[PDB]
Ligand binder design. Structure first.
Ligand code: A3P
Ligand code: CL
Ligand code: CL
Ligand code: CL
Ligand code: CL
Ligand code: CL
Ligand code: CL
Ligand code: CL
Ligand code: CL
Ligand code: CL
Ligand code: ZN
Ligand code: ZN
Ligand code: ZN
Ligand code: ZN
Ligand code: ZN
Length: 283
Protein backbone atom coordinates (compact mmCIF):
# COMPACT_ATOMS: atom_id res chain seq x y z
CA UNK A 1 0.00 0.00 0.00
CA UNK A 2 1.33 3.41 -1.02
CA UNK A 3 2.20 6.20 1.41
CA UNK A 4 0.52 9.63 1.26
CA UNK A 5 2.03 11.83 -1.46
CA UNK A 6 5.11 13.96 -0.89
CA UNK A 7 6.84 16.69 -2.89
CA UNK A 8 9.82 15.88 -5.15
CA UNK A 9 12.29 18.34 -6.66
CA UNK A 10 13.64 16.89 -9.91
CA UNK A 11 16.54 18.45 -11.78
CA UNK A 12 19.87 18.09 -13.50
CA UNK A 13 22.92 18.69 -11.28
CA UNK A 14 23.97 22.37 -10.80
CA UNK A 15 20.46 23.77 -11.39
CA UNK A 16 20.04 25.62 -8.07
CA UNK A 17 18.28 22.64 -6.45
CA UNK A 18 19.92 23.23 -3.05
CA UNK A 19 18.94 26.90 -3.10
CA UNK A 20 15.33 25.90 -3.82
CA UNK A 21 15.20 23.19 -1.14
CA UNK A 22 16.66 25.66 1.39
CA UNK A 23 14.06 28.31 0.48
CA UNK A 24 11.32 25.73 1.05
CA UNK A 25 12.93 24.63 4.36
CA UNK A 26 11.74 27.94 5.82
CA UNK A 27 8.05 27.19 5.30
CA UNK A 28 6.13 26.01 8.38
CA UNK A 29 4.08 23.50 6.32
CA UNK A 30 7.13 21.85 4.75
CA UNK A 31 10.14 19.81 5.82
CA UNK A 32 12.98 20.10 3.33
CA UNK A 33 16.26 18.37 4.33
CA UNK A 34 19.60 17.65 2.62
CA UNK A 35 19.54 14.49 0.48
CA UNK A 36 18.09 11.48 2.31
CA UNK A 37 19.45 8.89 -0.18
CA UNK A 38 16.45 6.59 0.44
CA UNK A 39 14.60 6.46 -2.90
CA UNK A 40 17.27 4.49 -4.84
CA UNK A 41 17.18 1.54 -2.36
CA UNK A 42 14.73 -1.18 -1.33
CA UNK A 43 16.00 -1.84 2.21
CA UNK A 44 18.13 -0.08 4.83
CA UNK A 45 20.85 -2.77 4.70
CA UNK A 46 21.10 -2.31 0.91
CA UNK A 47 21.42 1.44 1.50
CA UNK A 48 24.11 1.03 4.20
CA UNK A 49 26.13 -1.33 1.98
CA UNK A 50 25.83 0.67 -1.26
CA UNK A 51 25.74 4.33 -0.16
CA UNK A 52 29.15 5.88 -0.82
CA UNK A 53 29.42 9.67 -1.13
CA UNK A 54 32.27 12.18 -1.65
CA UNK A 55 31.07 14.17 1.36
CA UNK A 56 29.30 13.10 4.56
CA UNK A 57 25.68 13.04 3.28
CA UNK A 58 24.09 13.33 6.72
CA UNK A 59 20.64 14.44 5.47
CA UNK A 60 19.00 11.46 7.17
CA UNK A 61 21.04 11.89 10.38
CA UNK A 62 20.21 15.62 10.47
CA UNK A 63 16.54 14.86 9.82
CA UNK A 64 16.21 12.66 12.92
CA UNK A 65 18.22 15.24 14.91
CA UNK A 66 15.74 18.00 14.01
CA UNK A 67 12.45 16.10 14.31
CA UNK A 68 13.40 14.19 17.49
CA UNK A 69 15.68 16.83 19.10
CA UNK A 70 18.65 14.42 19.16
CA UNK A 71 22.40 14.88 19.17
CA UNK A 72 24.36 13.32 16.30
CA UNK A 73 25.35 10.19 18.22
CA UNK A 74 21.75 9.36 19.22
CA UNK A 75 20.47 9.98 15.68
CA UNK A 76 23.19 7.66 14.31
CA UNK A 77 22.25 4.99 16.89
CA UNK A 78 18.62 5.16 15.72
CA UNK A 79 19.61 4.81 12.04
CA UNK A 80 21.83 1.83 12.89
CA UNK A 81 18.84 0.17 14.57
CA UNK A 82 16.75 0.64 11.42
CA UNK A 83 19.62 -0.90 9.44
CA UNK A 84 19.98 -3.83 11.86
CA UNK A 85 16.28 -4.71 11.60
CA UNK A 86 16.57 -4.04 7.86
CA UNK A 87 13.45 -1.91 7.46
CA UNK A 88 12.23 -1.27 3.94
CA UNK A 89 12.81 2.20 2.52
CA UNK A 90 9.03 2.64 2.44
CA UNK A 91 8.89 1.94 6.20
CA UNK A 92 11.56 4.58 6.82
CA UNK A 93 9.69 7.12 4.72
CA UNK A 94 6.54 6.28 6.72
CA UNK A 95 8.48 6.89 9.95
CA UNK A 96 9.74 10.24 8.63
CA UNK A 97 6.20 11.24 7.62
CA UNK A 98 4.88 10.60 11.14
CA UNK A 99 7.79 12.40 12.81
CA UNK A 100 7.31 15.56 10.69
CA UNK A 101 3.48 15.49 10.55
CA UNK A 102 1.53 17.66 9.74
CA UNK A 103 4.40 19.02 7.60
CA UNK A 104 4.91 17.68 4.05
CA UNK A 105 8.28 16.21 3.07
CA UNK A 106 10.20 17.85 0.23
CA UNK A 107 12.52 15.26 -1.26
CA UNK A 108 15.27 16.74 -3.49
CA UNK A 109 18.17 15.04 -5.29
CA UNK A 110 19.61 15.67 -8.75
CA UNK A 111 20.61 12.00 -8.91
CA UNK A 112 16.96 10.79 -9.20
CA UNK A 113 16.77 12.06 -12.79
CA UNK A 114 19.80 9.98 -13.82
CA UNK A 115 17.84 6.71 -13.59
CA UNK A 116 14.29 6.26 -14.95
CA UNK A 117 13.78 3.36 -12.51
CA UNK A 118 14.39 5.68 -9.52
CA UNK A 119 11.76 8.16 -10.78
CA UNK A 120 9.35 5.23 -11.16
CA UNK A 121 10.02 4.11 -7.57
CA UNK A 122 8.55 7.41 -6.31
CA UNK A 123 5.24 6.54 -7.96
CA UNK A 124 5.50 2.99 -6.59
CA UNK A 125 6.00 4.06 -2.97
CA UNK A 126 3.78 7.16 -2.77
CA UNK A 127 0.32 8.11 -3.97
CA UNK A 128 -0.36 11.45 -5.71
CA UNK A 129 3.00 13.09 -5.06
CA UNK A 130 3.71 16.49 -6.58
CA UNK A 131 6.76 17.12 -8.75
CA UNK A 132 8.69 20.35 -9.05
CA UNK A 133 10.73 20.25 -12.27
CA UNK A 134 13.64 22.65 -11.88
CA UNK A 135 15.51 23.53 -15.10
CA UNK A 136 18.59 25.65 -15.84
CA UNK A 137 20.19 26.72 -19.13
CA UNK A 138 22.50 23.98 -20.42
CA UNK A 139 25.48 26.37 -20.84
CA UNK A 140 25.28 27.32 -17.16
CA UNK A 141 24.96 23.72 -15.99
CA UNK A 142 27.82 22.55 -18.22
CA UNK A 143 30.22 25.31 -17.12
CA UNK A 144 29.43 24.59 -13.47
CA UNK A 145 29.71 20.78 -13.75
CA UNK A 146 33.12 21.05 -15.46
CA UNK A 147 34.38 23.74 -13.03
CA UNK A 148 33.40 21.51 -10.07
CA UNK A 149 35.21 18.54 -11.68
CA UNK A 150 32.21 16.23 -11.36
CA UNK A 151 32.97 14.06 -14.43
CA UNK A 152 34.35 11.30 -12.14
CA UNK A 153 30.94 10.83 -10.46
CA UNK A 154 29.36 9.65 -13.74
CA UNK A 155 32.01 6.95 -14.19
CA UNK A 156 33.34 8.94 -17.16
CA UNK A 157 36.62 10.58 -16.12
CA UNK A 158 38.33 9.44 -19.33
CA UNK A 159 35.94 11.20 -21.73
CA UNK A 160 35.74 14.91 -22.65
CA UNK A 161 34.55 16.75 -19.49
CA UNK A 162 32.36 19.14 -21.48
CA UNK A 163 30.66 16.28 -23.33
CA UNK A 164 30.24 14.32 -20.07
CA UNK A 165 28.60 17.39 -18.49
CA UNK A 166 26.39 17.85 -21.55
CA UNK A 167 25.29 14.20 -21.42
CA UNK A 168 24.38 14.57 -17.72
CA UNK A 169 22.22 17.63 -18.47
CA UNK A 170 20.65 16.01 -21.56
CA UNK A 171 19.95 12.61 -19.97
CA UNK A 172 18.60 14.04 -16.69
CA UNK A 173 16.27 16.41 -18.51
CA UNK A 174 15.10 13.87 -21.08
CA UNK A 175 14.43 11.35 -18.28
CA UNK A 176 12.36 13.93 -16.37
CA UNK A 177 10.45 14.95 -19.50
CA UNK A 178 9.68 11.29 -20.28
CA UNK A 179 8.60 10.55 -16.71
CA UNK A 180 6.41 13.63 -16.31
CA UNK A 181 4.75 13.13 -19.71
CA UNK A 182 2.91 10.16 -18.15
CA UNK A 183 1.62 12.05 -15.09
CA UNK A 184 -1.34 14.38 -14.60
CA UNK A 185 -0.49 17.99 -15.53
CA UNK A 186 -2.05 18.84 -12.17
CA UNK A 187 0.78 17.04 -10.27
CA UNK A 188 3.71 18.84 -11.93
CA UNK A 189 5.10 22.36 -11.98
CA UNK A 190 8.12 23.72 -13.82
CA UNK A 191 10.52 26.26 -12.33
CA UNK A 192 13.28 27.89 -14.37
CA UNK A 193 16.38 28.64 -12.30
CA UNK A 194 16.75 31.94 -14.12
CA UNK A 195 13.24 33.02 -13.02
CA UNK A 196 13.85 31.68 -9.50
CA UNK A 197 16.82 33.96 -8.86
CA UNK A 198 15.63 37.02 -10.85
CA UNK A 199 11.98 36.97 -9.68
CA UNK A 200 11.90 34.79 -6.54
CA UNK A 201 8.69 36.42 -5.22
CA UNK A 202 6.71 35.56 -8.37
CA UNK A 203 8.20 32.07 -8.71
CA UNK A 204 7.62 31.18 -5.06
CA UNK A 205 4.09 32.62 -5.01
CA UNK A 206 3.14 30.49 -8.03
CA UNK A 207 4.84 27.46 -6.42
CA UNK A 208 2.85 28.05 -3.21
CA UNK A 209 -0.39 27.98 -5.24
CA UNK A 210 0.70 24.69 -6.82
CA UNK A 211 1.53 23.18 -3.42
CA UNK A 212 -1.68 24.57 -1.83
CA UNK A 213 0.20 26.33 0.97
CA UNK A 214 0.08 30.03 1.84
CA UNK A 215 3.06 32.27 1.07
CA UNK A 216 5.37 32.79 4.05
CA UNK A 217 8.08 35.49 4.25
CA UNK A 218 10.64 32.83 5.23
CA UNK A 219 10.61 31.53 1.63
CA UNK A 220 12.56 34.62 0.55
CA UNK A 221 15.14 34.34 3.34
CA UNK A 222 17.20 31.18 2.78
CA UNK A 223 20.10 32.48 4.94
CA UNK A 224 17.92 32.90 8.04
CA UNK A 225 17.00 30.30 10.68
CA UNK A 226 17.97 26.62 10.91
CA UNK A 227 17.62 25.13 7.45
CA UNK A 228 20.05 22.25 7.95
CA UNK A 229 22.97 24.08 6.33
CA UNK A 230 24.82 24.97 9.55
CA UNK A 231 27.58 23.24 11.51
CA UNK A 232 30.09 21.06 9.66
CA UNK A 233 29.79 22.07 6.00
CA UNK A 234 30.71 18.60 4.66
CA UNK A 235 27.79 17.07 6.60
CA UNK A 236 25.06 18.58 4.37
CA UNK A 237 26.91 17.75 1.14
CA UNK A 238 26.70 14.52 -0.82
CA UNK A 239 28.03 14.49 -4.37
CA UNK A 240 29.53 17.97 -4.82
CA UNK A 241 29.42 21.44 -3.27
CA UNK A 242 26.32 23.45 -4.23
CA UNK A 243 28.28 26.57 -3.17
CA UNK A 244 25.23 27.86 -1.31
CA UNK A 245 27.42 29.16 1.53
CA UNK A 246 29.59 31.13 -0.93
CA UNK A 247 26.63 33.52 -1.26
CA UNK A 248 24.60 35.50 1.27
CA UNK A 249 21.45 36.31 -0.72
CA UNK A 250 19.41 34.98 -3.64
CA UNK A 251 22.02 35.98 -6.21
CA UNK A 252 20.36 37.09 -9.44
CA UNK A 253 23.69 37.54 -11.24
CA UNK A 254 24.06 33.79 -11.76
CA UNK A 255 20.98 33.62 -14.04
CA UNK A 256 22.34 35.32 -17.18
CA UNK A 257 25.73 33.56 -17.24
CA UNK A 258 24.62 31.57 -20.29
CA UNK A 259 24.66 34.80 -22.33
CA UNK A 260 28.46 34.95 -22.13
CA UNK A 261 29.62 31.40 -21.37
CA UNK A 262 31.82 30.09 -24.19
CA UNK A 263 31.87 26.31 -24.41
CA UNK A 264 34.58 24.63 -26.53
CA UNK A 265 32.02 22.85 -28.73
CA UNK A 266 28.49 23.62 -29.94
CA UNK A 267 25.96 21.45 -28.12
CA UNK A 268 25.11 18.20 -29.90
CA UNK A 269 21.99 18.22 -32.07
CA UNK A 270 20.07 16.05 -29.56
CA UNK A 271 20.93 18.44 -26.73
CA UNK A 272 19.83 21.43 -28.82
CA UNK A 273 16.42 19.78 -29.33
CA UNK A 274 15.97 19.37 -25.56
CA UNK A 275 16.97 23.03 -25.09
CA UNK A 276 14.36 24.02 -27.69
CA UNK A 277 11.65 22.02 -25.92
CA UNK A 278 12.58 23.86 -22.72
CA UNK A 279 12.54 27.24 -24.52
CA UNK A 280 16.24 28.02 -23.95
CA UNK A 281 18.08 30.17 -26.52
CA UNK A 282 21.52 29.07 -27.67
CA UNK A 283 23.79 32.03 -28.52
N1 A3P B 1 22.37 31.93 -3.07
C1 A3P B 1 22.34 31.56 -4.37
N2 A3P B 1 21.79 32.34 -5.34
C2 A3P B 1 21.75 31.98 -6.64
N3 A3P B 1 22.25 30.80 -7.08
C3 A3P B 1 22.82 29.94 -6.21
C4 A3P B 1 22.92 30.26 -4.79
N4 A3P B 1 23.53 29.22 -4.18
C5 A3P B 1 23.82 28.32 -5.15
N5 A3P B 1 23.39 28.74 -6.36
C6 A3P B 1 23.54 28.06 -7.67
O1 A3P B 1 23.22 26.68 -7.52
C7 A3P B 1 24.21 25.89 -8.17
C8 A3P B 1 24.26 24.53 -7.52
O2 A3P B 1 23.05 23.86 -7.90
P1 A3P B 1 22.66 22.47 -7.18
O3 A3P B 1 22.27 22.83 -5.77
O4 A3P B 1 21.52 21.93 -7.98
O5 A3P B 1 23.94 21.68 -7.25
C9 A3P B 1 25.50 26.68 -7.98
O6 A3P B 1 26.48 26.29 -8.95
P2 A3P B 1 27.90 27.07 -9.03
O7 A3P B 1 28.19 27.54 -7.63
O8 A3P B 1 28.85 26.00 -9.51
O9 A3P B 1 27.70 28.17 -10.04
C10 A3P B 1 24.99 28.11 -8.14
O10 A3P B 1 25.02 28.51 -9.51
CL1 CL C 1 24.89 18.68 -8.27
CL1 CL D 1 22.62 19.09 -5.32
CL1 CL E 1 19.83 10.04 -3.96
CL1 CL F 1 22.22 7.37 -3.31
CL1 CL G 1 30.04 15.89 10.97
CL1 CL H 1 26.14 19.83 -5.10
CL1 CL I 1 29.92 26.74 0.06
CL1 CL J 1 27.00 24.81 0.47
CL1 CL K 1 25.71 36.71 -2.89
ZN1 ZN L 1 21.87 9.57 -3.20
ZN1 ZN M 1 28.74 14.11 11.26
ZN1 ZN N 1 24.36 19.88 -6.47
ZN1 ZN O 1 29.20 24.64 0.17
ZN1 ZN P 1 26.57 35.73 -4.70
Amino acid sequence: SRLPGIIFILSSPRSGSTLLRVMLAGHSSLFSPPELHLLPFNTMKERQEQLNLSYLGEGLQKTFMEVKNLDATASQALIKDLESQNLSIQQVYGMLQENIAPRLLVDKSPTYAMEPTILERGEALFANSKYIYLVRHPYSVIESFVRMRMQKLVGLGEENPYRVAEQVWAKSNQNILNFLSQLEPERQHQIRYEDLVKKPQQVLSQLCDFLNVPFEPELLQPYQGDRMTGGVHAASLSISDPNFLKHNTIDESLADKWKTIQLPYPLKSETQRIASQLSYELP
